[PDB]
Design a protein around this nucleic acid. Structure first.
Ligand SMILES: [Mg+2]
Ligand SMILES: [Mg+2]
Ligand SMILES: [Mg+2]
Ligand SMILES: [Mg+2]
Ligand SMILES: [Mg+2]
Ligand SMILES: [Mg+2]
Ligand SMILES: [Mg+2]
Ligand SMILES: [Mg+2]
Ligand SMILES: [Mg+2]
Lengths: 144, 75, 185, 100, 62, 66, 142, 141
RNA sequence: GUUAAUUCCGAUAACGAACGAGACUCUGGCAUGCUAACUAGUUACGCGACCCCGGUCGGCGUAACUUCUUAGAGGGACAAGUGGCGUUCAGCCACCCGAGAUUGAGCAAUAACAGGUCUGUGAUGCCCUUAGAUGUCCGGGGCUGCACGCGCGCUACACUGACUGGCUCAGCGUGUGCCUACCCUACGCCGGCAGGCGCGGGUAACCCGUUGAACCCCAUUCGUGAUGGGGAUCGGGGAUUGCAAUUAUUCCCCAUGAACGAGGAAUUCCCAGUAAGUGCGGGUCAUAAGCUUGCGUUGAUUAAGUCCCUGCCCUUUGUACACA
């Protein structure tokens, strides 16, 4: 019951990121980029996993089932509106972008705007605020 | 300055460490048990709750913010 | 009805106030015995009506501090209830008697004031007020950023002060106040 | 033959004067009345800075305007009440007549 | 040095720089005849007891 | 600070000299006496006049008032 | 036979609670709900001050139904407290000798005065230039 | 003769929720797990079977005060919305949950659309709620 | 001497006056006494539903009444009563009875400031310009621009907490428009959400609405970790207002997850339903409150003093100052 399992893992290495094993499974998945507190919860309810368990306590086969669901959300009845790379500007596919690929698309979008000298791209190039905030009195210590 | 490293699940050494003298504490709460054993509060809440089920401690007051336990009457 | 006992369990009788300087500034006895430390008020209209408040109410009012929980009486009323529950089961006597002994041993007996400073003695009422104030602020700073809850931080603060342990926050401040007044004498 | 007359006025001293006149006028023509019902007073509030410019201590003006409403019902046909309502009205008071 | 405790009989007036300490006359209940003038801090009434750690100092009148 | 102004003291001192016989010793009766015998445009100084008149009665009963 | 009906109100900040007291067999309900479950339950001994200071036998023979409206959670609690205490005294006045009113009034008053007399304090209006009745905004000398 | 008013309400909802689950005709929707119960929440409900509890709760409310519609239900289930650095306000509950729960309790004869709009408790429903109140009273005593 | 007071008593080369203060208006409290109430209710009665005669019903209908609600007229408090202090005067302290023994505002003197406002005004002198216009209209941009300094604030640093469920309580007050376009919303379906489509009520004590508000209360999960604290920055998608939203109007969803562990010198506001916490209305408003103006709600620690600091008033006094 409360005795530690013989196979308990303190770190789980998944998606080229570490997952703490002492943390609850719902909040341990959140450690990888592309999943938040709520994307994790629905993923491990599509896969029947006891919420009370911890990340170091669940066995390997049910772990690898989670990655398949996370990398392939649509094929397991995850709603379309629930993703973060919906209807992208290259292949028009609704996909969930995760730990390592999230930094690639974020970089691609920034240079996409800067390439053609759109106003939002210029402000990113100059390292300035892009959503219309007043720059007179705020965000100073970053800019010296 | 000082950091706490509380284990989340009992090792064998600490599990019976609880089972022996904790049922003889005057005041049994998850707060006091957590730091006498260096354990998570959630583990303390679960560990204290299963001792009541067996019946080696008796509940004196139950509330959301605090749950309080003592030991059974002497003799 | 007789035997008005606090929270329906703690009998206010058989509580002895050994110190005679604080007889009539402590309200625990039969006329001042209530079921709850919650009451309407009108206790701040005149000057010395403050000393007719049952002291459990006075302790309850002083736990509503540091911004987050101003005007939250029911939460502090709950706090005192659990504090009295575990003062009983940890020491084995009436929680009311522990609280009274905590007040006496905690209140400073001489303070310093500017008349370079001059040493003066404190009136019995302000002796009670500083006793209550020190006990609450000691529990508050013990329970901050700590796993242990407020209700037992108050409880062990009272138990330590009732015995004059000099480990409680209240007793440490008392010795520091009088020793400075001793030098300024 | 269910009629109701609405008395609304900003001035309450003359409003009670007019209201008392109509009831007595009804009682002398022996037709039953249900007394004046005093509905809640509608207060009109405007709050405005005292100053035309922008400076000065931030003082404010509170302008009120109260509206008092009374209702009278009668057991009578329309011809008798017309000569009652046609007389003895303060210029402040305004009266409407409806058939319920 | 024993601790003596005494009762107030009358209030003379408020002294101190900010007027924060009251000056009173008290008598020791051990010797109900000997009276001393002392400065007390806090709201003091007539007929209450003060606990004197030191009882041979005597404050000047205002 | 219950100090009676001149407009109360002057009115009471006039009433006492002209209606000494009718006045009494209680506040409530000579409050009605003052109300009917002088036109006092509100209740509050009617009470304050009647209160001073009652106070003047006791001084008059003991002896003269200058 | 004859109806022995007494209706008495109770006041707090804004909560008014009026109690209908008849001749009954010792039934107490607030909005159709007995005194033992009225949130908050931490202030439950308050609703039981008039009953417990007197006992069931004085409340025997009368059935009280209290309706409450306005105010807040704690204000309604205090309104019921006063309403039951006032209604029972008013009942014993009209249908029993006031020799019974005497001791019943003194035991309530000696415990606390607000159980029979209404608290007269109310919230006061906000003044301009500040966030509340008396607090002001910050001065800005420099 | 006990009634809903007599027994404590908190465990009455829990007792009545179990009654709905063991009956098994409630017709729960298929998005009960991926839905967020209100715009002011942050996470999906912790309990997986919240729909049986919400259905139990709304039947209790129609019992006490009838004539309630979806707008009434989304008002009664609202709460404080935390806006981050902005001050927090009041935000109404989810409408869709109100409709599906009300229609679910209408498919099996507990409530019906009365005149004047909204739903009210069907006489059959009034019996079933009074049944559970008896169970709650007996267990606690 | 007394007073919150140039308020009174009393002395008196002054006497009789005027304004200011007070008085006054509104507001809070209380009246089982009065006038009354289908656009407010209560209690009874009769049906109806449910449960084991009774209990619950904001389910339906009507006979009395006004306690609750509304709003009118009166009443009530005057330092009146008692005990002390005091020229025994003006008055002060305490206590009884009492709802109340200082509720909170409005109005508010003489004299002045070279205080602000010519950008409120068809209030206005003089000056300037007046057809390539300093008139007026249209298109676009800016008033939001960012190495830095300061002022008013909002959110936080967590366990007296955060999250997820359950339970249970308000008071102010607005609502369909002269030109003028734009109102508050019930209910029923669609959508996960913002929202959409249909029907209805309301010019309002009639409908929204018994305004089912938050905090608070009860039960879960978390466990001292910048952590489920915190929510800045930022990417992608969906709605709504608009003639148009990019320099993102506002709202919704997923993801991203910064500083911050209580804040130096210094300084602000405040004493009873007060501070503080908490939410709701109005103004601005096509779109809409981190502001301000009101409303309730939970609700204290300290104090009944002083002239030490910062200042104000009166008398005496010194002055080589008088834009002081
Ligand atoms: Mg703690
Ligand atoms: Mg809610
Ligand atoms: Mg100038
Ligand atoms: Mg020129
Ligand atoms: Mg600007
Ligand atoms: Mg975090
Ligand atoms: Mg958070
Ligand atoms: Mg503005
Ligand atoms: Mg000189």
């Amino acid at each position: 019951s409360l005795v530690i399992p013989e196979k308990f893992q303190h770190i789980l290495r998944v998606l080229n990121t570490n997952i703490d094993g002492r943390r609850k499974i719902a909040f341990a998945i959140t450690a990888i980029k592309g999943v938040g507190r709520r994307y994790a919860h629905v993923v491990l309810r599509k896969a029947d996993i006891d919420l009370t368990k911890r990340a170091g306590e669940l066995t390997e086969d049910e772990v690898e089932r989670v990655i398949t669901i996370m990398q392939n959300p649509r094929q397991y009845k995850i709603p379309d509106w629930f993703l973060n790379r919906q209807k992208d500007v290259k292949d028009g596919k609704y996909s969930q972008v995760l730990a390592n690929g999230l930094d690639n698309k974020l970089r691609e979008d920034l240079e996409r705007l800067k390439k053609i000298r759109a106003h939002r791209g210029l402000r990113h190039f100059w390292g300035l605020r892009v959503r219309g905030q007043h720059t007179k009195t705020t965000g100073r210590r970053g800019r010296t | 300055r000082d950091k706490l490293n509380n284990l989340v699940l009992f090792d064998k050494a600490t599990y019976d460490k609880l089972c022996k003298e904790v049922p003889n504490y005057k005041l049994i709460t998850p707060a006091v048990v957590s730091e006498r054993l260096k354990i998570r509060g959630s583990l303390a809440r679960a560990a204290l709750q299963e001792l009541l089920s067996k019946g080696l401690i008796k509940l004196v007051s139950k509330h959301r913010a605090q749950v309080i336990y003592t030991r059974n009457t002497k003799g | 009805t007789p035997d008005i006992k606090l929270f329906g369990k703690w009998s206010t009788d058989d509580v002895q106030i050994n110190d005679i300087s604080l007889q009539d500034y402590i309200a625990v006895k039969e006329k001042y015995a209530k079921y709850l430390p919650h009451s309407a008020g009108r206790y701040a209209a005149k000057r010395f009506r403050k000393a007719q408040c049952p002291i459990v109410e006075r302790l309850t009012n002083s736990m509503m501090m540091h911004g987050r929980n101003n005007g939250k009486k029911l939460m502090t009323v709950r706090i005192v209830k659990h504090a009295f529950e575990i003062i009983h089961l940890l020491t084995g006597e009436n929680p009311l008697q522990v609280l009274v002994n905590a007040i006496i041993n905690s209140g400073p007996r001489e303070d310093s004031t500017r008349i370079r400073r001059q040493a003066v003695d404190v009136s019995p009422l302000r002796r009670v007020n500083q006793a209550i104030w020190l006990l609450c602020t000691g529990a508050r700073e013990a329970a901050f950023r700590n796993i242990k809850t407020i209700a037992e931080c108050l409880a062990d603060e009272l138990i330590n002060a009732a015995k004059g342990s000099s480990n409680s926050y209240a007793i440490k401040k008392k010795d520091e106040l009088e020793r400075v007044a001793k030098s300024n004498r | 033959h269910r009629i109701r007359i609405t008395l609304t006025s900003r001035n309450v001293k003359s409003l009670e004067k007019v209201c008392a006149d109509l009831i007595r006028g009804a009682k002398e023509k022996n037709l039953k009345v249900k007394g004046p019902v005093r509905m809640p007073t509608k207060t009109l509030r405007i709050t405005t800075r005292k100053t035309p410019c922008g400076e000065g201590s931030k003082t404010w003006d509170r302008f009120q305007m109260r509206i008092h409403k009374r209702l009278i019902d009668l057991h009578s046909p329309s011809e008798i009440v017309k000569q009652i309502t046609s007389i003895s009205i303060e210029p402040g008071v305004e009266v409407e007549v409806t058939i319920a | 040095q024993p601790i003596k405790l005494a009762r107030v009989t009358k209030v003379l007036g408020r002294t101190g720089s900010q007027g924060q300490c009251t000056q009173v006359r008290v008598e020791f209940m051990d010797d109900t005849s000997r009276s001393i003038i002392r400065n007390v801090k806090g709201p003091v009434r007539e007929g209450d007891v003060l606990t004197l750690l030191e009882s041979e100092r005597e404050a000047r009148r205002l | 600070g219950r100090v009676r102004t001149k407009t109360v003291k002057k009115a009471a001192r006039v009433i006492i000299e002209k209606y000494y016989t009718r006045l009494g010793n209680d506040f409530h009766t000579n409050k009605r006496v003052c109300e009917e015998i002088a036109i006092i445009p509100s209740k509050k100084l009617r009470n304050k006049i009647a209160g001073y008149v009652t106070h003047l009665m006791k001084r008059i009963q003991r002896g003269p008032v200058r | 036979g004859p109806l022995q009906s007494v209706q008495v109100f109770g006041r707090k900040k804004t909560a008014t609670a009026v109690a209908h007291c008849k001749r009954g067999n010792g039934l107490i309900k607030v909005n159709g709900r007995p005194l033992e479950m009225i949130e908050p339950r931490t202030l439950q001994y308050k609703l039981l001050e008039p009953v417990l200071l007197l006992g069931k036998e004085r409340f025997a023979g009368v059935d009280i139904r209290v309706r409450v409206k306005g105010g807040g959670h704690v204000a309604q609690i205090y309104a019921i407290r006063q309403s039951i205490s006032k209604a029972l005294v008013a009942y014993y006045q009209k249908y029993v000798d006031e020799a019974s009113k005497k001791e019943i009034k003194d035991i309530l008053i000696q415990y606390d005065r607000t159980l029979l007399v209404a608290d007269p304090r109310r919230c006061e209006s906000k003044k301009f230039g500040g966030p509340g009745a008396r607090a002001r905004y910050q001065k800005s000398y420099r | 003769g006990v009634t809903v008013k007599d027994v404590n309400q908190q465990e009455f909802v829990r007792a009545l929720a179990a009654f709905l689950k063991k009956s098994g005709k409630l017709k729960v929707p298929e998005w009960v797990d991926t839905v967020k119960l209100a715009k002011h929440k942050e996470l999906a409900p912790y309990d997986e079977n919240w729909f049986y509890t919400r259905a139990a709760s709304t039947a209790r409310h129609l019992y006490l005060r009838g004539g309630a519609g979806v707008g009434s239900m989304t008002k009664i289930y609202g709460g404080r919305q935390r806006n981050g650095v902005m001050p927090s306000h009041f935000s109404r509950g989810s409408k869709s949950v109100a409709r599906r729960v009300l229609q679910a309790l209408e498919g099996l004869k507990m409530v019906e659309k009365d005149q004047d709009g909204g739903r009210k408790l069907t006489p059959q429903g009034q019996r079933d709620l009074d049944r559970i109140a008896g169970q709650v009273a007996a267990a606690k005593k």
